Structure to design on (231 residues):
């Protein structure tokens, strides 16, 4: 009848498309709440009745499992992402090789580097890890526009107020007004990974069928459309 999914908000467009298709094919209504992974996990801990949880990171899945709210043996890393350097779509920058030698100052030409605040925004935390490993953090620190969330960071680039920004690959696909000009080296930061799991008490055939659908080729097509890497 109805499946309730708690999903990281970045998954909205992909999961909405998947839910429409699943209702059409299987006559099951999938309804999703979209929010930060931490809030979804705490709400499950506090008794909210979700059937499935898709986190945008492994740490909040660890939290939900350690609270004994999850069928831990269903944990499945569903998607990956890349950490990317974006520019406004019509920027004269098109390709940046990102390594220890990158001339960040020449690229910015005095403009700001838009990031999520590295004190707390996921994309900012990954950006800081990568830039520290690349030896570029200290020289860029006063050049960053430290936004309160990744949407706000990307908006600076969409409006061409910041000539570069750092977001996830799927963020750059969502926003038609920015382009990926470089991919941060995968060796330089923790993987961006989205685990899913069934919530304890919701391990029934209906929920399992949708869980299986999420990791099937039909859903993979839709995740790829929105810039995620199906695993």
């Amino acid at each position: 009848d109805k499946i309730t999914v708690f999903a990281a908000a970045s998954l909205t467009n992909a999961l909405q498309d998947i839910a429409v298709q699943y209702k059409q094919e299987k006559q099951v209504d999938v309804v999703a709440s979209y929010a930060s992974s931490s809030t979804l996990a705490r709400q499950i801990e506090q008794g909210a009745p979700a059937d499935l949880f898709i986190s945008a990171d492994q740490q909040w899945m660890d939290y939900a499992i350690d609270k004994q709210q999850i069928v831990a043996n269903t944990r499945y890393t569903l998607l990956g992402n890349e950490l990317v350097l974006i520019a406004p779509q019509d920027s004269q920058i098109d390709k940046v090789e990102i390594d220890k030698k990158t001339d960040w100052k020449k690229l910015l030409e005095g403009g700001r580097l838009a990031v999520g605040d590295p004190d707390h925004v996921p994309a900012g935390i990954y950006a800081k890890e990568s830039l520290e490993n690349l030896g570029a953090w200290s020289t860029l620190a006063p050049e960053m526009a430290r936004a309160n969330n990744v949407r706000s960071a990307m908006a600076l680039v969409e409006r061409a107020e910041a000539p570069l920004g750092i977001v996830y690959g799927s963020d750059a696909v969502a926003s038609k007004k920015v382009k990926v000009v470089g991919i941060f080296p995968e060796a330089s930061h923790k993987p961006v990974e989205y685990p899913m799991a069934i919530v304890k008490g919701h391990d029934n055939p209906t929920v399992t069928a949708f869980y299986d659908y999420l990791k099937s080729p039909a859903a993979a097509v839709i995740f790829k459309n929105y810039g995620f890497t199906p695993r």
The domain at 81-192 is CATH 3.40.190.10 (D-Maltodextrin-Binding Protein; domain 2). The chain has two domains: 1-80+193-231, 81-192. DSSP finds ten helices and eleven strands in the chain.
